[PDB]
Amino acid sequence: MDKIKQLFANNYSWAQRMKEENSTYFKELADHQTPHYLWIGCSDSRVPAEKLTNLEPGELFVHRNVANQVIHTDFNCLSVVQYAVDVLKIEHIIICGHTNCGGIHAAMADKDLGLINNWLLHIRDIWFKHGHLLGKLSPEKRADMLTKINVAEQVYNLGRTSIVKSAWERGQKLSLHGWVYDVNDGFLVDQGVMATSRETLEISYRNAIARLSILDEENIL
Amino acid sequence: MDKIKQLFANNYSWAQRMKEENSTYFKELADHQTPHYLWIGCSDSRVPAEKLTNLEPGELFVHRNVANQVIHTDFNCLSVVQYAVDVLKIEHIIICGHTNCGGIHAAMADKDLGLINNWLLHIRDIWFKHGHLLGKLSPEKRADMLTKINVAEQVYNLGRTSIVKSAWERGQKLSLHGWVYDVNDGFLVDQGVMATSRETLEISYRNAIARLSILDEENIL
Amino acid sequence: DKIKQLFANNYSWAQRMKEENSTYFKELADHQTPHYLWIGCSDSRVPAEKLTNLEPGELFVHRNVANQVIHTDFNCLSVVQYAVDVLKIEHIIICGHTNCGGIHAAMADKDLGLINNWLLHIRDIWFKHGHLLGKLSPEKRADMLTKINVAEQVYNLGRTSIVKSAWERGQKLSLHGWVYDVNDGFLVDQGVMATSRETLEISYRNAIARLSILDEENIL
Amino acid sequence: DKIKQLFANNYSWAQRMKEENSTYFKELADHQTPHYLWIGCSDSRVPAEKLTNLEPGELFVHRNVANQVIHTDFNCLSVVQYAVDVLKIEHIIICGHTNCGGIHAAMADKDLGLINNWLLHIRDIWFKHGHLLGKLSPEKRADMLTKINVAEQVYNLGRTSIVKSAWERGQKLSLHGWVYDVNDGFLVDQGVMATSRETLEISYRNAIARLSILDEENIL
Ligand SMILES: [Co+2]
Ligand SMILES: [Co+2]
Ligand SMILES: [Co+2]
Ligand SMILES: [Co+2]
């Protein structure tokens, strides 16, 4: 209103300032025609992907949804992956989770929020998968563990899609990554699930969970 | 590989450089706990939303999919909207399209791409909706018109979801926007579909199409 | 109580069968793989087995509100890819019905909740033919929409990557769109019938054109 | 040819009915609104009408591969919200079947295409019970998975916002999970039966525990 009019003014000021400087930005960008990374992050979008990775303009192909999920039967996410992998021939897909995630917390609370709750049931199913692990943890540290287990689970989901299986069976080079950053520092931490094939997917996911299962005593009660 | 290791180095360099400067960035961000805008853009993600709008960190709630679609029965997009509107109480949803869009072009070509084609059928259905308009145009200008008609159609879809209808029937303040930017300049151009209610949705969408239907003769053959 | 009735009915039926030495279950298992995919409405007014008098297990069945093949519905598309790629079914039939609650719900202004999102595809279809349906007597609209809806769903299925790929590799696959009137149960072809991309384009445009000729008793 | 057969059968059937002055269509229309939602498998080995001997139009029906209620499937959730919110159906039944191709497909290593994504939910379910199913003789696994799958689907439906909201507002809604053996057609309750969140939690955990006791003839 005031806000939208501002936004257009902000934008104009920027775009025009880019003209009055014949700015290479839109030239540099158009030369990176095709992205090299598919980035699956959360709609929370706290610290922008472009800022975490400092990749140049147009390098990232991006999907965001609530709590950075790759649901087995989500047409939306799968289309993005199939297009990225089969059409764009992208060789890295990054799933990025983040701490203090609204979806993670909502998946965890009892409030019935409406339609989103259904979306969040998959995180709840995951929470239950590692219920022993998570109840062996401090209530105020659970959201953070769950965020990481989530990322690891989402990578495992990604690597089980028929799109990714079929890209690997057919020879394509494709690596899967699962990372989290603390919103207070923005350090990307690899969660351990990294696959370039079906066998490394399974070995890698089992190892990551095993690794997540050794608790620092500053996490236990 | 080399690329991923680089990314982590880039990221480390950034995050650490943010420490050695006790940088307010992550403090400022955490004070914008809740977003004020839902931004539905394309996974192409050419010019980042944060750069178009120059909004401060954490202000945007973001969804991206191929060709910035709001499909009536997409659980993924709808969850993002229902969460944004009902939980986050966001009062502006922006659908942003962009020129030279990979999905737009793919929707337009005959190549069978696999799974993504199904996703793109909705754009094809739209292309057919304005077939008279678009065949009354220069072949090299069609993708650009289709990009804009798309945005306008997606806003019209958004404003017809039960989530948005029900937010309006129940008194909530919610405005819908549909914009495109040229990837060569980044000027956000409003496409005319702007609604704050069901009646302004319909009036606004009819007017936008009517307006799109008057051609400059530098667009006609 | 309602459930107790249903277990009882079920027991009476399945025992009536065991003690009779019923060849039914035996005969059902000798038909391991179906030959038709039938995509119908959840209203399911008269069952596909009654309409088609097919041998048990010949039908692979998907039902959803108003018998849609929505471009991006994982569920129906999963059913289709499995019937086509895996089960090698060579006939997919979409079958509407008159007096379809799904069709009536799509046209009413009422705000019903989540199902309205599902039915917005129908509304998009009603708009594409708003001229025709608008040249028509409003009380006859639902029945025309029932039929147009079926024709669009066949056009939709014919355009799925799954069907196109089945056709590009020589697989024999044909698509059908039928409606039956709930008052007599007769299966009426709606004219869209495809065995290929080209035949899909032609009968579709043909079906619509033939649907768009209104009887002057209904014309506005 | 296969289609000509089906129109012929259909004509013979619906005419047999008209000339007989069949009370069937009349009686069908006096049952405008169904009372059960039935979520079944597309394999559709024996039809819900045969299993339940219900009066025509009592069943509102959704079928998909392996009878799933997937948390985020618009299609099934559209069927459920419409049966529950709009049609006021007070019974939702999920019904598995033994010798389910969907269940067999989920367990096989084979890469079948898009349908494998659909079946990954089943695999997640198989893993959740991999201990139990792993304590079990491999050739008996599919039948146990058929039954566990049904129990998880009821647990899934019981957790949808739609069912929870129907329960939070006092609406009478109960959920059922049944399996029938394709060799005899008997409807067997799998123990998860819910009329509320609390009863959902208890019978679910109860059903699994009772499913997890293996007959020593099958124990590893
Ligand atoms: Co988040
Ligand atoms: Co684009
Ligand atoms: Co119907
Ligand atoms: Co089955």
Tab-separated table of N, CA, C and O and ligand atoms in Angstrom, chain B residues 42 44 98 101-102, ligand 2:
chain	number	residue	atom	x	y	z
B	42	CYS	N	9.946	-17.850	-9.472
B	42	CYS	CA	10.390	-18.915	-10.270
B	42	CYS	C	11.692	-19.455	-9.724
B	42	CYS	O	12.531	-18.727	-9.152
B	44	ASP	N	14.049	-20.347	-11.437
B	44	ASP	CA	15.124	-19.750	-12.252
B	44	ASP	C	15.906	-18.789	-11.377
B	44	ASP	O	17.134	-18.786	-11.381
B	98	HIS	N	9.317	-13.550	-14.712
B	98	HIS	CA	10.473	-12.848	-15.225
B	98	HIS	C	10.583	-13.153	-16.699
B	98	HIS	O	10.085	-14.159	-17.168
B	101	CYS	N	12.138	-16.578	-19.229
B	101	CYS	CA	11.935	-17.682	-18.245
B	101	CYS	C	12.047	-19.077	-18.855
B	101	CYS	O	11.278	-19.402	-19.703
B	102	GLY	N	12.956	-19.919	-18.386
B	102	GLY	CA	13.050	-21.303	-18.862
B	102	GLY	C	11.743	-22.090	-18.883
B	102	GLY	O	11.502	-22.875	-19.822
E	2	CO	CO	11.697	-18.644	-14.847
